[PDB]
Every structure is written in structure tokens, then in C-alpha cells.
């Protein structure tokens, strides 16, 4: 399987495979880590210019990503790998065949949940250690305690407590002592998404039937209930720019923003991500800015910006609608044909079964654009089956020729 002439380098045109992305800050630079099959890529929020890539491909597909400063924790099968700048430094191997699903890293505790409802706790060998390595203990949640684990979350100002969220309800476990300290009341609807709110002791819960719950742990009681009938929550996030805004992502591909102070809907973004590919898999507000990052299974990562209000007074009332800032994307299906655009080897033309022709950059810019299908005067075209390109006459006339499936003519394109 190893070549003496060739070795894998990286993947082009794939920004996200559908796994939720993880975000972090390195000094003044914010970065976004996205899973790409058996490898991951880190993009700079300022420009969506890639920074680092995995040195090697994992033996198994990565299930979940967690990013903490210079270290990103990736889980595949029963092993959790700790990566730095895309370089593998220390690998965490679980003692059970059960594969990992949900990861939470707070302080020196690394928490991994397997499909068998077993949570593995790891701790730093030294207080100044950079990453947890040592195995602290194992905590398993049984069916009587709760249902299948939805996600592992840790709230701020909690001393060694893991807010385990299950389909049935939420459970509070003290990792240091390994005891179930509190069980929340059963919820009628299945929980799908859990997001810690910027407020304290309140964690947002997304159900399968369009319900968002501001469950306050401290009171052990519901605080609020947003209703989105005929919808399923896929992601949640809060605005930390000083405005109490909550972004609700849905599997239908719609991202909704609420003014939770005003109990009103600021705006709705429709069909940002394809419903067939899972809609909005992940939508996170950037920490302390009006920028929200959204992703989906359609191989697209997108940015929105909230423009400051146009009204001198009652600025909280007149909220500018979200706007296209920048995005990276590519084919939604495997490419059918590939070719080298220029001798300098800086851009690639690529066609896939999604009826689209795309140009991908091979440099750190990661620039990507879909060649326009708008016709000159004298739905997408059928699938490209063959293509030829030359560069003797770029800028003078058409130089690309393409053949389509079940089509009796060929169309030309200009690079």
C-alpha cells in the first residue's frame, strides 16, 4: 500500500465532510478545524486561508473534533489522537472496542464517550502538562440512569463536573469523584443538540421537534421554550458581542436568529446548506464578534456578518440582516474529471456528478470558484464525461471543450 515513488500530500476542494467543525483562538487569530474524510484542515477566520493540515491520514474516519489553543483532539474508531499544527505527538487508545463519539476537554480532564454509553476520563500526569495523557477513571451511564449520550458538555464555573446530555435527559457527573451528582427531569422529546450558554448554569437544548430549551441547571427547571414546529434542531449558538442573539440551525437548511431579549425573530436564512446533505450541521458564533460560521454536509463553509444598525437610536430594534462575508466550498459529489489548468500548476479544473465545473487553487489561499453557466446570446448542464484544455490562446477566445452525458453537442468554456 506504500509507494516508493509517491506519498499522499493533501486533499483539494473538500472543506468539510459533515462532521461538526471546532473553533478556537491562537492569540489574536481565530481558526476553524474541519474534518475531511480521514484528514482535517485548519482555516484562518480572517481570510479562510488554510494554515495546517494533518501530517498523515488516520486509520479510521474521524468522528468528532475538539480544538484547544495549539492542540486539536481528533477521535477515530477507539483511539483519540492529539495533534499540534497537524503533527501527531501523542495518541490516546481506549481499552474497549467501542468507538468514540463525543469528546469534551476542560482543564486537565479529557472525556471520551463510546457507543456503549461509557465515558472515559483522562487526566494530565503533571499540572503543567500540555495535554491530558493519564487515564483517570471510567464512568458508564446505564439505561436506567439515562438514554444514549447526545453530547458531552462542561459549563463554566463547575469544579470537575461533566454535564452529560442524553436523549432521555441531562446528567451531571463529577469526574474527580465519578459519581452522578444530579439527574435532570425527563424530557418528552428526544434531545439532539446541547450548547452551553454564555450565561451561567444555563445550557441550551435542541429537540427533534423544533424545541429549544434554556434549561437552568442551578434551579433544575425550565427557564424558556422556543417553538419551531415542523423542524429539527441541528446546531445552536449564542452571540457574545454584547447582543443576546441565539442562532438555531435546522436539518432543513434554515438558520434562524432570535432576539432573546425581545422574544422576537430577527431574521431567517433560508437554504444556506442543502437539506439532502443534512442542512446546517454546525453553526457557531465567533467569540466576541458579529461573525457566525456555518457548515454543512454539502462541502461548503460559509461566513455571515451582522452590519451595525443603520438607526442612530433604538439600534437594538433595527437589526441589519445577515450578509455574505466569505466562504469556501467545492463539489457536493465525487469529481468525475480532473485536469491541470496551467503549466505553473496553481489552479485545477474539476467536474463532478453535481452538474458543476469548479476551479480549485493549490496554494495556501485555498481559493475556489464555480465557472458561470450563464449563456452568451447570438438548470445546470448534464454531466461532463470528457474535457480538454489548452493555454496557447488564453485571453483571446475559448480554450476549454467539454462533452456531456446523453448530449449530441459539446460546450466551450473560457478559463
Amino acid at each position: 500500500k506504500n509507494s516508493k515513488i509517491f506519498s499522499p500530500f493533501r486533499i483539494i476542494g473538500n472543506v468539510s465532510n459533515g462532521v461538526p467543525f471546532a473553533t478556537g483562538t491562537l492569540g489574536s487569530t481565530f481558526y476553524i478545524v474541519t474534518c475531511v474524510g480521514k484528514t482535517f484542515q485548519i482555516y484562518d477566520a480572517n481570510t479562510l486561508h488554510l494554515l495546517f493540515v494533518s501530517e498523515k491520514e488516520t486509520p479510521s474516519s474521524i468522528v468528532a473534533l475538539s480544538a484547544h489553543f495549539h492542540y486539536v483532539y481528533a477521535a477515530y474508531e477507539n483511539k483519540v489522537g492529539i495533534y499540534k499544527r497537524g503533527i501527531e505527538e501523542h495518541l490516546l487508545e481506549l481499552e474497549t472496542d467501542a468507538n468514540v463519539e463525543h469528546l469534551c476537554i476542560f482543564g486537565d480532564y479529557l472525556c471520551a464517550s463510546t457507543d456503549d454509553n461509557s465515558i472515559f476520563i483522562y487526566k494530565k500526569s503533571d499540572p503543567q502538562d500540555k495535554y491530558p495523557s493519564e487515564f483517570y477513571t471510567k464512568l458508564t451511564v446505564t439505561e436506567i440512569q439515562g438514554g444514549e449520550i447526545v453530547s458531552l458538555q462542561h459549563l463554566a464555573t463547575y469544579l470537575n463536573k461533566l454535564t452529560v446530555v442524553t436523549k432521555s435527559n441531562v446528567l451531571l457527573f463529577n469526574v474527580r469523584t465519578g459519581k452522578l451528582v444530579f439527574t435532570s427531569n425527563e424530557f418528552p422529546d428526544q434531545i439532539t443538540t446541547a450548547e452551553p450558554a454564555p450565561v451561567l448554569d444555563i445550557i441550551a437544548l435542541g429537540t427533534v421537534t423544533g424545541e429549544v430549551i434554556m434549561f437552568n441547571m442551578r434551579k433544575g427547571k425550565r427557564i424558556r421554550t422556543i417553538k419551531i414546529p415542523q423542524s429539527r434542531i441541528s446546531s445552536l449558538s449564542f452571540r457574545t458581542d454584547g447582543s443576546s442573539h441565539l442562532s438555531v440551525g435546522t436539518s432543513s437548511g434554515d438558520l434562524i436568529f432570535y432576539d432573546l431579549d425581545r422574544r422576537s425573530r430577527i431574521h431567517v436564512l433560508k437554504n444556506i446548506h442543502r437539506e439532502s446533505y443534512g442542512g446546517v450541521t454546525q453553526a457557531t458564533f465567533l467569540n466576541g464578534q458579529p461573525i457566525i460560521v456555518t457548515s454543512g454536509g454539502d462541502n461548503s463553509l460559509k461566513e455571515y456578518v451582522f452590519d451595525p444598525s443603520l438607526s442612530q437610536g433604538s439600534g437594538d430594534v433595527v437589526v441589519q440582516p445577515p450578509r455574505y462575508l466569505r466562504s469556501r466550498g467545492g463539489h457536493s459529489q465525487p469529481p468525475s474529471y480532473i485536469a491541470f489548468a496551467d503549466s505553473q500548476s496553481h489552479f485545477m479544473l474539476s467536474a463532478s456528478k453535481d452538474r458543476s465545473l469548479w476551479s480549485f487553487s493549490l496554494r495556501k489561499d485555498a481559493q475556489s470558484q464555480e465557472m458561470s453557466q450563464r449563456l452568451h446570446k447570438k438548470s445546470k448542464f448534464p454531466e461532463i464525461v470528457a474535457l480538454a484544455i489548452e493555454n496557447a490562446r488564453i485571453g483571446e477566445w475559448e480554450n476549454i471543450i467539454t462533452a456531456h452525458k446523453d448530449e449530441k453537442f459539446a460546450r466551450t468554456w473560457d478559463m
Binding site: 469544579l159 427557564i223 419551531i228 414546529p229
Partner: protein, 113 residues
């Protein structure tokens, strides 16, 4: 002895005191013009700076509220308001034409074969 009310009125005029104006201005209201979890570990655990866990949590509690100001919603917890409720529930207000047996007046859904 404290000054008389008459003296205060004269003092206000001379020194240009405007505090009475601002207090009325501040009092201006437009309407008038018109233990779920108890963990033994947290009590016993002692954290070096050495302070008790509960007091440490409260200070770390108090540290967080400096980091992020608390918003007002967390404080917050026939019928006339039915319209406001339904508008909140749905962002779709077009009646689905699939049920409607009468075609739309202006928009014709037509596809070539």
C-alpha cells in the same frame, strides 16, 4: 442649624444648582405624564491560591460575571395575544397550494416536456 426651604430656593438660583432638575428628569416616567446538586467533594476540597472550594466557586462565579455582563433575558422567565404567538411559531405564512384545489390567480406552475 440646617437652612430653611426658602433659603434653599434662593441658594439654587444663585449658585446655578441643577441637581433638582436632573432628579426630576431621572424620575421622569413616560406613563405618569400620560442546591439541585450537592457534592460533598466541593465542600471538602481545598484549592491553593488555600481557600475552601465553595468560597472559591463564588469568587470564580464573581469573576465570570466581570468577564461577560449578564443579559436581561436570564432574569426573565378569547386571548388577545394569539396573533403574536402564531407569528412566533411559524416563519411560513403562505398557505400551501398543494391543498388548494383552485390554481393561483397570477402564478402559473408550468413545465415543458
Amino acid at each position: 442649624p440646617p437652612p430653611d426651604e426658602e433659603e434653599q430656593l434662593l441658594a439654587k438660583f444663585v449658585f446655578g444648582d441643577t441637581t433638582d432638575l436632573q432628579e426630576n428628569l431621572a424620575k421622569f416616567n413616560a406613563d405618569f405624564i400620560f442546591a439541585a446538586w450537592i457534592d460533598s467533594d466541593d465542600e471538602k476540597i481545598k484549592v491553593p491560591i488555600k481557600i475552601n472550594g465553595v468560597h472559591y466557586i463564588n469568587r470564580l462565579r464573581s469573576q465570570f460575571e466581570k468577564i461577560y455582563p449578564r443579559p436581561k433575558w436570564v432574569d426573565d422567565e378569547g386571548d388577545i395575544n394569539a396573533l403574536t404567538k402564531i407569528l412566533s411559531t411559524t416563519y411560513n405564512y403562505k398557505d400551501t397550494l398543494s391543498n388548494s384545489k383552485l390554481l393561483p390567480p397570477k402564478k402559473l406552475d408550468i413545465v415543458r416536456l
